[PDB]
Amino acid sequence: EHVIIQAEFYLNPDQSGEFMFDFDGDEIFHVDMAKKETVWRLEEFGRFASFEAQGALANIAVDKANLEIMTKRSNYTPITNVPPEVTVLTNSPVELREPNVLICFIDKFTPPVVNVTWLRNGKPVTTGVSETVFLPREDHLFRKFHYLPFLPSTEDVYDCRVEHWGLDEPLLKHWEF
Amino acid sequence: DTRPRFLEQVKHECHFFNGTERVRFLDRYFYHQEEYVRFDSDVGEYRAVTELGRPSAEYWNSQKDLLEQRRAAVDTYCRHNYGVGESFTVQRRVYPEVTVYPAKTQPHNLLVCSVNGFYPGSIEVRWFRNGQEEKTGVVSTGLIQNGDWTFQTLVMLETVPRSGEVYTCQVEHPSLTSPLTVEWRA
Amino acid sequence: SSLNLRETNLDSL
Ligand SMILES: *[C@@H]1O[C@H](CO)[C@@H](O)[C@H](O)[C@H]1NC(C)=O
Ligand SMILES: *[C@@H]1O[C@H](CO)[C@@H](O)[C@H](O)[C@H]1NC(C)=O
Numbered sequence: 001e002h003v004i005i006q007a008e009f010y011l012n013p014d015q016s017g018e019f020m021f022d023f024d025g026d027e028i029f030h031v032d033m034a035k036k037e038t039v040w041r042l043e044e045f046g047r048f049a050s051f052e053a054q055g056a057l058a059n060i061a062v063d064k065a066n067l068e069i070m071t072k073r074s075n076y077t078p079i080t081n082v083p084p085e086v087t088v089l090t091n092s093p094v095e096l097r098e099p100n101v102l103i104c105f106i107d108k109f110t111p112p113v114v115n116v117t118w119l120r121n122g123k124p125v126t127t128g129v130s131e132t133v134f135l136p137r138e139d140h141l142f143r144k145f146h147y148l149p150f151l152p153s154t155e156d157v158y159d160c161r162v163e164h165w166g167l168d169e170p171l172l173k174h175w176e177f
Numbered sequence: 178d179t180r181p182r183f184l185e186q187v188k189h190e191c192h193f194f195n196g197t198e199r200v201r202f203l204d205r206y207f208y209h210q211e212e213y214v215r216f217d218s219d220v221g222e223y224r225a226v227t228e229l230g231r232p233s234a235e236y237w238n239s240q241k242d243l244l245e246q247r248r249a250a251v252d253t254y255c256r257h258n259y260g261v262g263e264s265f266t267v268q269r270r271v272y273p274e275v276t277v278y279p280a281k282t283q284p285h286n287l288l289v290c291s292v293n294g295f296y297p298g299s300i301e302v303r304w305f306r307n308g309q310e311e312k313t314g315v316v317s318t319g320l321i322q323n324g325d326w327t328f329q330t331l332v333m334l335e336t337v338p339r340s341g342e343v344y345t346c347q348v349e350h351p352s353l354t355s356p357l358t359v360e361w362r363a
Numbered sequence: 364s365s366l367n368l369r370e371t372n373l374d375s376l
Contacts (some may be wrong), residue, residue, distance in 0.1 A: 001266060006369055007187040013180055021258075023266045023364065024297065026326050028366075042265075042326060043280040049261050051366045059187075059371040060259055064375045067185035070208045073229055078181030079209040091323065092293045093276045103323060110210065111182045132324050140186060145324030165178070187370040236375040243372060254369050261366050337370070 004028075008135040010063035011101035011111055012071070018112070018133055019056035030133045031056040041132075082141055083166030086139065088159075088173040094152045102145040102175060104160035112142045115163040119172075120156055150176055179280030179286045183207050202250040208232065209313075223247075271296040271327060272352035277344070277361045280333070288334040288361060290346035294327045297351065302332040305345035311336070338363035 005022040020030035027041040031053045040046040084106045091101035106114060114132035118125040128149045133157045134142040146160065157176040164171075186207035193200055199255070203221070204216035211257040212228030214237075216223045220318055222244065223234040268309035279285035292302055298320055304311045314335035321329050332346070340363050 001195065002193040002254070002259075004191040004193075004262070004266075006187075008187040008371065010185045012183045014182070023262065025322065026324075028266070045262075045265055048265055048364075049366050050364055052368075056368075056369045059368065062371040062373050063185050063187060066206075066371075067183060069374045069376055070185060070213070070229065071183050073232070073375070074208060076181075078185075079184050082180075089321065089329075092274070092329075093278060093291045105322075105324075111184055113225065114183075135324070136186070136188065140207055140212070165182075187371050233372075233374050237372050246370070250369065254367055258366050261364060 006062050006118060009112065009134075009136075010067050011087075011113070012059055012067055014113060015064075017060040019034060019060060020135075021051075025135075027135060033057070033060065036160065040137070053109055053120050062157055076095060079111050080106065081164070081166035082110045082163055084114065084164055084171070084174045086160060086162050086171050088175045090175070094177060096152050096154070096177070098152070099154055100130070102148040102150055102158055102160075104148070104162070104173065105143070105145040106146070108137065108139075109122060109143075109164055109166065111165070114144065116144075116163045117161040118145045118146070119159045119161060120147045120150075122157075122159075179263060188262065189250075191256070191258065193255070197256050200251045200255045201248070202255050204247060206230065206249070208306055214300055216253050218248070219250055265347055267338070269296050269326065270352040273300070273344060273348055273350055273357065275348050275359045277346050277359045278343075279361070282335065286335065286337055286345075288330045288336060288338075288344055289327070290334070290348075293329040295329075295350055295352065296327055298322075298328050299351060300328070300330060301349040302330065302335045303347045303349075304332070305347060306336070307342055307346075313343075 010017045021028040029040045032039050038051045039170045040176040064078050089103050106150050124128050130147045159172045162171045188205045190203040200216040207215045207314045212226045214233040223237045225231040225234045240340040278289050280287040280289050317332045342363050344361045346359050
């Protein structure tokens with residue numbers, strides 16, 4: 001019926017960690033490791049619940065120590081790259097001149113390292129983009145969302161470009177009116 | 178970068194059946210994707226899942242204080258956090274916005290029922306033609322997670338509309354008390 | 364009001 005997961009990971013040699021809660025496959029919050037702060041996925045969550053972000057940092061420190069231990073135990077057997085599947089969709093039916101959001105959905109990949117670029121008419125876009133942390137899957141791969149708000153025109157074409165160590169070349173997924 | 182990678186994952190899982198009547202806790206440890214050791218609240222001890230996890234199980238099972246923490250988890254962790262978050266997670270209801278627009282499978286012979294913005298995920302979408310349900314010729318995206326605590330789904334009816342026909346897309350969803358229906362006329 | 368964590372165990376060599 002319902003599942004709440006506290007999911008952690010730690011990645012060598014990148015020294016990347018993550019700590020988050022998941023409810024039925026949606027992110028409740030994660031802990032920004034650099035700023036040492038709780039980041040609620042929706043603002044409204046932070047007004048009914050609180051979380052002491054310090055304890056997460058302690059859990060990641062154990063995760064790092066355990067990764068060293070398990071690495072030795074496996075005789076330094078590394079991960080196998082699993083390349084992502086990428087879908088581009090809109091938040092809602094597209095009307096000319098009415099604002100909308102492009103969603104780039106990156107699914108079913110590991111390790112949790114990826115370069116994602118939005119292109120408008122073949123040029124990288126920066127303004128107004130946002131993204132999620134790596135969301136865990138039940139098969140213990142990852143998925144991730146990237147967001148680009150935009151004004152639909154007949155002029156502009158868009159592509160989501162995804163790079164991952166499992167791909168021989170970047171994956172581009174296209175959208176136009 | 179081509180250097181080999183190594184990943185540790187831990188998932189502390191709380192599973193809820195009929196509210197908090199039946200709760201099950203799983204303390205799960207992974208090397209890359211391979212779960213090597215697990216505490217299951219049905220068992221009350223860590224058990225190796227693979228060979229790689231045998232030393233872990235023996236080590237943690239020798240720590241009585243650790244084990245007694247994990248045995249109370251269904252109460253002090255799972256049921257607790259369920260109570261803290263229940264109002265904005267278990268009780269979250271966002272009803273769907275329903276659009277119907279025509280489309281063409283080959284350059285209109287396709288009616289798209291776009292169902293957007295709803296939470297939670299369980300949804301039923303049906304197509305009607307002049308008050309009769311149309312079950313043949315329906316394709317869908319399936320359920321799509323938007324990643325922002327909303328879902329969407331497109332449900333497409335293949336059909337050749339004749340003039341004087343009313344098509345109806347009907348949407349059922351836990352946020353609704355009676356089915357939501359949108360019409361399209363040819 | 365407060366979400367609790369669940370501590371991760373240090374393993375052994
Ligand atoms: C690790 O190496 C030892 C020998 O030093 C061997 O017994 C063991 O099976 C190896 N484990 C793996 C997963 O390769
Ligand atoms: C991301 O790009 C940087 C260079 O800007 C590169 O070093 C890194 O390996 C890339 N990551 C992936 C997963 O391709």
